[PDB]
C-alpha cells in the first residue's frame, strides 16, 4: 500500500539525474501524529531545516564543481537562489516545514527575494512543478515538501 | 500488488515528466467495488470532479508560470483545454466519473467544445492514448480515468 | 513467476510507450494448470480473442487520431479490413497458448483481417516475448502487436 | 402458465418465417429484476449487444443466402440497415439493452442514420411494430427487446 | 417453459409441410449436460447419424414419391445433396453431431462436396436459415441440429 | 409434456383443413404397452380398423358434400373408394397390426386392395409430410395415419 | 427536526397563493434513500410524471377561469411550464426531470415551451420558483427537491 | 404529510382572512385509516354536512354583517356556494360532497347555484378555493379532503 | 424545535422571497464542538465554503435570468466581478471564524475581491436576519451569505 | 407547544424585520420555575442587562448602517441613544428586576433616563403590539422587550 510516495521519489530522482541540478526530498519518519507532534515541538529538528541545509550544500558543491582532490560543499547561502514546492495537503505541517526552510536559508545568508514558493494541490503533482523550477536557469536548487507517508 | 495499476501510474507519471504538461490520474483500485458503486452517486464523491478541479488548477498555474514570490493558481477555467482519457472497463463507474469531470469543467468555466475524449478498452492501454493526447499543442491539461475492481 | 511477469509487463509497456504502437498482453491472474484448462473452454471468446479485439480497436483509434459538434469524441472501430498485426506466442504451456492463438486468429478473420496479413512468431518462454514483440513493432508494415504469456 | 411471452415469441417467429428476413428477439432470462440490473451493469457484452451481433451476422449471411463447402456469417456491419423494437415497460433495462445494441452496431460498422427505433407501450405490441419494420424494403434485420422477468 | 424448443420444432414442421421437402431435426432436452455429453460419446451413434440416415431415407422415398403398392424409403446416398444447419452455441456437441452426420453421408454414398454447412448464432435463429437452405432447388433434404 | 404427438396432430389437422380432404389420425397415450398389445391382439379393437371405418365414412360423406330438416350423412360403402395409408416403422409390432386391421376393414367393406396406397416413414415425426404428399394426389380420397405414444 | 421540508413547502404555497398560478412541489424526503432508489425504477412515472400531470391539469383548469362541474383536461398542447430542479441528490433529480419532461412531451407540451432552472440546494428552490412564476409566459410551475 | 396537512389549513385560513369570505374546511388527522373507512356514511351526519351547514350560517351572518346581537340562521334560500373536492380518497370525498349537497338542498339552496371543482389533491385545493372565492357571485366556499 | 433557529430561518427565507435576492443560510446540529472541529480540520473545507459556492452560483443564475429548443439557465462558479455580504454571529466564534475564513477563501480563490467582500458581526443568531436585510437593501450587494451557530 | 412564547417571538421578529429597527427579547424560566425564581439576578445574571447591551450595540451599528475589506463593528456607547422598553405585569417580581437591570445597563453605558420610554402591558401576549407602537416612533432607536412565562 505505497504508490504515491514511491512514484514521487522516483520522479524527483529521475528529474535530478536528467537536469543535473540538486533536488532535495524529505519523507515523513515512521508516524503521522507522533511525527507531527515532534516536528511542532522542535524547531531545528524538523526535516525542512535539514533539507534546506542539504540544498545549500549541494548548490555550493555544484558551483565549485563547475595529496588528492577534495570536493566539499560550503554552507554559504550568499547569492544563492532556491525553489520550494509545497504540497497543500497536511498544510498544518507543510507550512511549518516551509517556515523552517525559509528561516534556515535567511539565517545562512539567502535573501527572501531569491526564494520562489510554489504550492501544488497534492503530493502527486510535486514532480512536474519541481521540473519547471529546475528548468528555470536562475534557480540553483529545488526543495520539495510532501507528507504522504506513514 | 497490481501490475496493471503500477504500470498505469508509472507510465502516466513518466509521460507527465517527459512532456512537462499537467497530467492527472486517480487510483481507486484499492477501494472495494461496492464502495465505488456507492461513491458513484453523491454531491462531491466524483473522482472525475476532483481530477478536473486539479487539472484546471495545474493548467492555470502553468500558464501563470510560463517577500518570497508565491504562485498558487486560480480556479478559472475560461479558455482552458483538456484531454480526457476513459477506460471502457467498469464503464458503469468510469462514465459517471467522466460526466462528473465534464460537469466540473463546464461549471468552472470550460467550454464543452474544447474537451477531447478518448476511449480505450483498458487501463493497460490508457497511458499511450494519454500520451498521444498530451502531445497535442492545443491541449492544456490531461486527465485519465481508469478503475480496476 | 512474479519477477518474470513484472519484467515482461514493464518491458512491453516501455516498448509500447517508446514506439507509440499499441501492444496487448493478457494473462490469467495467478492461474493454475487445472484452472487454466477449465477457463480455456468458452463460447464468447478467449483471452487471445479479447486481446485481438483490443488491438483492432486501438489500431483504428490511432489511425483516426493521426489521420460531434457539441463535444469531440474519438473512438476506435472494430473493423479489421486492411489491418496488419503481429503475434508473439510462447511455447511454455503450449496446450493453452495454441488455444489463445487460435482464438486471436479467429477473431481477426471474423472481424475482417487477412490471414496473409496475420504474422506469427514463436518464442521459447515468456521471458523472450518482449524482445520479439519490439522487433515486430519496429516493422513499418505492422499496425499492432499482440503477445500471449503464461503465469503460474 | 405464461401467455404474453409465448404469444410474442410465436408471432415474431411466424413473421420472420413469412417475411424471410432475420428477426432476433431477446427476453429477460433472469427471474429477478435485480439480476437483470446486474446483467445490464455487466461488461460491454449485454443482451442487447448479443442480439445486435446476431442480427449483424444473420444479415451478412443473408446478403449471399437470400471437403464440404461451409457457410458462416461475418461480423462486418458496413452498409447494413437495422430496425429496433423496444417496449416501454421496464424502461430502466430496455434503455440499457437499446444502448448496448446501438453501441455494438456502431462499433461493428453500422451508421446511426441507418438505425430505426420504435417504442411500443408493452411487450404485447412488439409483433405488430416488428412486422411493420420488417415489411420495409430498406431494412435488413429486426431486433426486438421484450421483458419477461 | 421450453418456448425456444417448441418454437423451433413448430417452425421446422411448418416449413417442411409448406415446401414439401424432407426436413429432419434433432434435439436433446430430457438429459442434463453431462448425460447429453455421455450419450454423444456413446459408441452406438450420435443423433446426427440417425438424422442423416432419416434424411437419406426420406430423400430416396421422395425421389419416386414426387415424380396393393407399397412405397418405402431407400438407403442409397449416391446423388444426394444435404443442407445441414448447426448452432455455434455449445459447439462441444453440435460439432460431434455434424461430424456424425457427415460420416453417415460419406459412408452411405453421399459425395463430400454435395454437403452444405450453415452455422447460426442460436437455435432461435435455426429455423429461418433452415427454410432458406430448403428453398434451394438443388437440395434433397435439410438436417437441423438444436441444443436445449 | 410431449412434442412429437402435438406436432403431428397440429400438422395433420392443418393439412386436412388446407386441402379440404378427410385426414384421420389415430394416436393413443392413455394405453400402456400391455394395453396396446391387447388392442393389437383384439381384432375388433384395432385402432387401425376404427380409423379405416372413419375414413370410409368421411369419404362417403364428402362424395355428397362436395357435389323438414335435411341432414347430410355418410355411408360405409367402401366400393369405388381409394385411400392412402401412412405407417411408421417405429413400434412396427403394433403398426403392422393396425395396418392389417385397416386393410381388412376396407376390403370387407368393399374397397379393393389394388386401390390402397401404403407409404412407410421411419418415425412418427415425418408422418405429416408424407400424409400431405398422399393427400395432394387427385385419386386419393382420404388419408389414414396411425401413431403410438 | 424538520426545517427545510417545512420552509420550502410553506414558501412555495405562499408564492402560489400570492401569484394565483399553479405550483406543484415534490415532498418525499420523509422516506428512505432505498425507497427513493426503488421509485427510480418503476412504471412510466413515479414523482415527476405525476407532478407534471397535475400541473397540466391545473393549467387547463385555470385556462377557463383566468349545476356546473369543472374538471381539468389532460391535453398539454399550448401550455408553458417552469421546471425547478435541485443539484443535490442529482442521481434522483435527473430521473424526476426526465419523467416530467417525458410526461409533458407525450401529453402535448413543446420542448421549446419547457423551461428548466437548476439550484444548488432545496433551500433556494422557492426564490427561483417565484422568479419563474413571475414571468407572464409561464402557465404552471413544477419543482422537485429531495433532502437526504 | 404533516407539513402538507398544516399548509392546506394555513393557506385556507389566510385566504379567508384576505378575501373576507367564509371558508369552511373539515378534516380529521388524529385518527386511523380503519376508523376513516368505518365512518363512511354515518347516520348522525357526514363531515361535509356540518361544513355546509357552517357555510350557510356564515353566509347568512355576513348578509347582515356587510346592545347589538348578531346570530346566524339556517335558511339557505338565495345562497350560492363554491365546493372544492380532492380526487384522492374519492370513496369518501364523494360521500362528503353528497352530504354537503343534500344539506344545502334540504336547507333551501338550489343545485344550479352550486359550483363544484375537483383538483388532484390537498396541495392543489387551496389555490382553487381562493380562485372560487374571488368570484363575486360566490357567498361561501366549502372544501374537504382526506390526507392521512 | 429551537425557536431561535426556526425564526432565523423563516425570516431569512421571507427576506429572500420579498427582495428576490439570493440569501444562503447554513446550520448543522451535531456534537457541540467536536464535529465542528473535525469539519474545520477536513481538507475539503467548512460549511461556509459550500455556502459561498452556492451564493456565487445563485448570484450568477440571477444575473443571467435578469439579463436546443429547450432553454436551460445555469450559473457558473466564477466569482469575478461579484460582491457579497457576509453575516457572522459572535456566539460560538471559535467556529464562526472558521466558517468565515472558509467562505472568504472560497470567494477569493474562485475570483472574488477583498474590497467586494463585506463582513458584519452581530451579537447572536437572533440578530442575523435584520442585519442581512440591511445588507441586502444595498444596490451594490449581489448576494447575502449568513452564518449561524447551532449546537 | 408554548403558544404564547411562540406568538411573541414571531410577532417581535416580524415587526423588527418590517420596521428595520433593532428589537431584542428575553424570556425567564428557560429551565424551570424553581430555576427562574432562584435566578433573580444573583450576580450579573440579569437578562435585561444583556438585552439592553445588545440593543445598544445594534443601535450603534445601525447609526453607521443608516482597509480594502470593510467590516462593520458595533459599539457599546449609549450616549445620544433612545430606547423603548416593554414589560409585562405578570411575574412582575422578576419583571421589575429585568427592567432595573436594563435601565442600569443603559445608564452606566451612557444613556439618560429621560431618553428611556417604559411601557407596561398586562402580559406577554400584549408585548408585540406595544413593541411595534414604540418602534413606529421616529425618536426611538431600538426596542427591548422582557417577557416572562410561568
Curated annotation (Swiss-Prot), chains G, H:
One of its GO terms (molecular function) is 6,7-dimethyl-8-ribityllumazine synthase activity. Extremely thermostable. Has a melting temperature of 119.9 degrees Celsius. (2S)-2-hydroxy-3-oxobutyl phosphate binds at residue 39. Pfam families: DMRL_synthase. It is an enzyme of class 2 (transferase). Signal peptide: none annotated. Pathway: Cofactor biosynthesis; riboflavin biosynthesis; riboflavin from 2-hydroxy-3-oxobutyl phosphate and 5-amino-6-(D-ribitylamino)uracil: step 1/2. Belongs to the DMRL synthase family. PANTHER family: 6,7-DIMETHYL-8-RIBITYLLUMAZINE SYNTHASE, 6,7-DIMETHYL-8-RIBITYLLUMAZINE SYNTHASE DMRL SYNTHASE LUMAZINE SYNTHASE. This is 6,7-dimethyl-8-ribityllumazine synthase. It comes from Aquifex aeolicus (strain VF5).
From Swiss-Prot, chain J:
Extremely thermostable. Has a melting temperature of 119.9 degrees Celsius. Keywords: Riboflavin biosynthesis, Transferase. Coiled coil: none annotated. InterPro entries: LS (IPR034964), LS/RS (IPR002180), LS/RS_sf (IPR036467). (2S)-2-hydroxy-3-oxobutyl phosphate binds at residue 39. Pathway: Cofactor biosynthesis; riboflavin biosynthesis; riboflavin from 2-hydroxy-3-oxobutyl phosphate and 5-amino-6-(D-ribitylamino)uracil: step 1/2. The keyword Transferase applies. Gene3D superfamilies: Lumazine/riboflavin synthase. It catalyses: (2S)-2-hydroxy-3-oxobutyl phosphate + 5-amino-6-(D-ribitylamino)uracil = 6,7-dimethyl-8-(1-D-ribityl)lumazine + phosphate + 2 H2O + H(+). It comes from the Bacteria. Its EC number is 2.5.1.78. PANTHER family: 6,7-DIMETHYL-8-RIBITYLLUMAZINE SYNTHASE, 6,7-DIMETHYL-8-RIBITYLLUMAZINE SYNTHASE DMRL SYNTHASE LUMAZINE SYNTHASE. Belongs to the DMRL synthase family. Forms an icosahedral capsid composed of 60 subunits, arranged as a dodecamer of pentamers. Catalyzes the formation of 6,7-dimethyl-8-ribityllumazine by condensation of 5-amino-6-(D-ribitylamino)uracil with 3,4-dihydroxy-2-butanone 4-phosphate. This is the penultimate step in the biosynthesis of riboflavin. This is 6,7-dimethyl-8-ribityllumazine synthase. It comes from Aquifex aeolicus (strain VF5). The gene is ribH.
Amino acid at each position: 500500500f505505497d504508490y504515491i510516495a514511491s512514484v514521487v521519489s522516483k520522479g524527483l530522482a529521475n528529474l535530478s539525474l536528467e537536469l543535473r541540478k540538486p533536488v532535495t526530498f524529505d519523507i515523513i519518519t515512521a508516524d503521522t501524529l507522533e511525527q507531527a507532534i515532534e516536528r511542532a515541538g522542535t524547531k531545528h529538528g524538523n526535516k525542512g531545516w535539514e533539507a534546506a541545509l542539504s540544498a545549500i550544500e549541494m548548490a555550493n558543491l555544484f558551483k565549485s564543481l563547475r595529496s588528492m582532490e577534495i570536493y566539499e560543499g560550503k554552507l554559504t547561502a550568499e547569492g544563492l537562489r532556491f525553489g520550494i514546492v509545497a504540497s497543500r495537503f497536511n498544510h498544518a505541517l507543510v507550512d511549518r516545514l516551509v517556515e523552517g526552510a525559509i528561516d534556515c536559508i535567511v539565517r545562512h545568508g539567502g535573501r527572501e527575494e531569491d526564494i520562489t514558493l510554489v504550492r501544488v494541490p497534492g503530493s502527486w503533482e510535486i514532480p512536474v512543478a519541481a521540473g519547471e523550477l529546475a528548468r528555470k536557469e536562475d534557480i540553483d536548487a529545488v526543495i520539495a515538501f510532501g507528507d504522504l507517508i506513514r
